[PDB]
Design a protein around this ligand. Structure first.
Ligand SMILES: [Ca+2]
Ligand SMILES: [Ca+2]
Length: 684
């Protein structure tokens, strides 16, 4: 199979995700519409259900709307049975229309469709080569008051019909009853309630179990991707074991949302991308794209830096999911914002690095500020707009041109309102040119690309007032780029060298199988190098020019670079693959009596690669928490550690360069073969 083929769950770099709020798109079947309180036919009261559902998308896939737009994937609402109760928050009736106030993860949302309607979608989709991607919220159930069972469904979690338990009188401790997060730190954002939503207790072994079992269900119906919610509000440790269990079983591409407010590099957000075993929505690229194109607060320089810092921060920047907007900010088009500015923002995003998503009806230039006005009933299905045209012209290149799909990003020309940049993968090039200025045109003199000699026609055919150019050995002849114009001119040809485009997943134990997308690999089963170790023959499950699939060798766990060798010649090196010791379980380590100093923090390390392998660097886990579950001078932390292994660990205070250890002998611990566990040591 191709890297391109819908068959490929582990990479989305060649796709364009269409994100659609299921109930606001199209009501295909009206019999699975709510009754009364919870329902609005006319969808004027956006807090109510509007009747949209899975048969609605089906019908659209079939009359070629998605395929004509060129989107190759769809990201639907979390599908699980949500609370049926209507919650009246200060005068206004709220319904669980948005698919987030779940109540049974092992069942479907009847207003969206049945299990068979779900399967139906999976199939009408894969039929037209459109990958499906679901939302998933392992952080919580629904709203609830501990003093008040009467409020909503009191966070009640039912396992497949059978009630496991609600918020009030939670004798088992399935939930953090720690108050609600005030958000002053990371720690309080995790172990206290997200707003008024009943917070799961993951260190609880029923719930740890439930959630791994609830995703295998969905993966088994053939979802091709998982968009995780509120990842800043759950422990990384738990997210990592949950993930490793998924990759073990049915590796799909998984990206999470860690909300960010700016193009700025946030540390916890970056460490999350690199260590979690998942990718994130690209909130910092979003901040740049709105600043330069919508809001005129920043200029062409901002955009280029953002490109460069995200390229530097992220272990695999190409997995990150870019966007001009979504269901939690205001809609890009607003009355002052020009069409061409939305259109250029689209243009830009489709041609840029990472994985592009579009929130529904951006082809229809939809407005709506804040929530819910940013979530309206999808207005028309016209295939007539300039945004409709730009998306369908450009998003195909992600598949046909590997430079767009995996390539590098170079600046070739920039001033305050003009940006010309280049995407290159091996011999394939693409240059995008953009003048954001809607009144002055701009002479580009002295442009040098690494396009070969010839005349290159604007791929957009002039829909965005694109002109044509001529390369003479890269040097482009002088030209006026028009007002508000944008151009794309590209070049492809067959690679004849193994070159690793993508690898997915990037973290797993021995025995897991990964996918290596690329160009010029040939069809003669060669050798795959996990670092220094050749994998050959039968251990390689598939070998095709663009995609090799291969089992993880039983090497020591750690960070590895992956190379391919075809016909003797070796490919480029894809980095930061994480081989895990084995299966993982989340274990909470609690250290008492660990007084520190102003600004002295507490990490743990130990004898396995998951614990950093006696590191005091970026692999030592830390810093530990010490305000919510346990408090100073006790310190605690949740780690992803390997199932049933004896561990040797020690805590240490790190100040500047002053690492200062635990005295005595190493502490030791044998982990469970499944689940979660807790261990408590006294700082010695
Ligand atoms: Ca319906
Ligand atoms: Ca939480």
């Amino acid at each position: 199979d191709p890297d391109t083929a819908v068959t490929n769950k582990q990479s989305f770099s060649t796709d364009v995700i269409y994100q659609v709020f299921t109930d606001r798109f199209l009501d295909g079947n009206p019999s699975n519409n709510p009754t009364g309180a919870a329902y609005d036919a006319t969808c004027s009261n956006l807090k109510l259900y509007c009747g949209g559902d899975w048969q609605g998308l089906i019908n659209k896939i079939n009359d070629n709307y998605f395929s004509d737009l060129g989107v190759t994937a769809l990201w639907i609402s979390q599908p699980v049975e949500n609370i049926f109760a209507t919650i009246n928050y200060s005068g206004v009736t709220n319904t669980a229309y948005h698919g987030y106030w779940a109540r049974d993860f092992k069942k479907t949302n009847p207003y969206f469709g049945t299990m068979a309607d779900f399967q139906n979608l999976i199939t009408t989709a894969h039929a037209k080569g459109i990958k499906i991607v679901i939302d998933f919220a392992p952080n919580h159930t629904s709203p609830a008051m501990e003093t008040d069972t009467s409020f909503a469904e009191n966070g009640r979690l039912y396992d497949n019909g059978t009630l496991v338990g609600g918020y009030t009188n939670d004798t088992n401790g399935y939930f953090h009853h720690n108050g609600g997060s005030d958000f002053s730190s990371l720690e309080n954002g995790i172990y206290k309630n997200l707003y008024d939503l009943a917070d799961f207790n993951h260190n609880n072994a029923t719930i740890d179990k439930y959630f791994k079992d609830a995703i295998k269900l969905w993966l088994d119906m053939g979802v091709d991707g998982i968009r995780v919610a509120a990842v800043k509000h759950m422990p990384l440790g738990w997210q990592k074991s949950w993930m490793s269990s998924i990759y073990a079983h049915k590796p799909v591409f998984t990206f999470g949302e860690w909300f960010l407010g700016s193009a700025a590099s946030d540390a916890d957000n970056t460490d999350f991308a690199n260590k979690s075993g998942m990718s994130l929505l690209d909130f910092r690229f979003n901040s740049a794209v709105r600043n330069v194109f919508r809001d005129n607060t920043s200029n062409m320089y901002a955009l280029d830096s953002m490109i460069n810092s995200t390229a530097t921060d992220y272990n695999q920047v190409n997995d990150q999911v870019t966007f001009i907007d979504n269901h939690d900010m205001d809609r890009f088009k607003t009355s002052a914002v020009n069409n061409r500015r939305l259109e250029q923002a689209l243009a830009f995003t489709l041609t840029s690095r990472g994985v592009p998503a579009i929130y529904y009806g951006t082809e229809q230039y939809l407005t709506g500020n804040g929530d819910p006005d940013n979530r309206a009933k999808m207005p028309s299905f016209s295939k007539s707009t300039t945004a409709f045209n730009v998306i369908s012209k450009l998003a195909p290149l992600r598949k046909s041109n590997p430079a767009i799909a995996y390539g590098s990003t170079q600046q070739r020309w920039i001033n305050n309102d003009v940006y010309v940049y280049e995407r290159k993968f091996g011999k394939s090039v693409a240059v995008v040119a953009v003048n954001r200025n809607l009144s002055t045109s701009a002479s580009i003199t002295g442009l040098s690309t690494s396009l070969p000699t010839g005349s290159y026609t604007d791929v957009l055919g002039g829909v965005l007032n694109g002109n044509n150019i001529t390369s003479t050995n890269g040097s482009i002849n002088n030209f006026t780029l028009a007002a508000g114009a944008t151009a794309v001119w590209q070049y492809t040809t067959a690679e004849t060298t193994p070159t690793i485009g993508h690898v997915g997943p990037v973290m797993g134990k021995p025995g897991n199988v990964v996918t290596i997308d690329g160009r010029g690999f040939g069809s003669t089963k060669g050798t795959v190098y996990f670092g220094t170790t050749a994998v050959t023959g039968a251990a390689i499950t598939s070998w095709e020019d663009t995609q090799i699939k291969v089992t993880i060798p039983s090497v020591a766990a750690g960070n590895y670079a992956v190379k391919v060798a075809a016909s003797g010649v070796n490919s480029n090196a894809y980095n930061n693959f994480t081989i895990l010791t084995g299966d993982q379980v989340t274990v909470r380590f609690v250290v008492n009596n660990a007084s520190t100093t102003l600004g002295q923090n507490l990490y743990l390390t130990g004898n396995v690669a998951e614990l950093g392998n006696w590191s005091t660097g970026s692999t030592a886990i830390g810093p530990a928490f010490n305000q919510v579950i346990h408090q100073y001078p006790t310190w605690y932390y949740d780690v992803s550690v390997p199932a049933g292994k004896q561990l040797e660990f020690k805590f240490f205070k790190k100040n500047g360069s002053t690492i200062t250890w635990e005295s005595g002998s190493n502490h030791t611990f044998t982990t469970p073969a499944s689940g979660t566990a807790t261990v408590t040591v006294n700082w010695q």
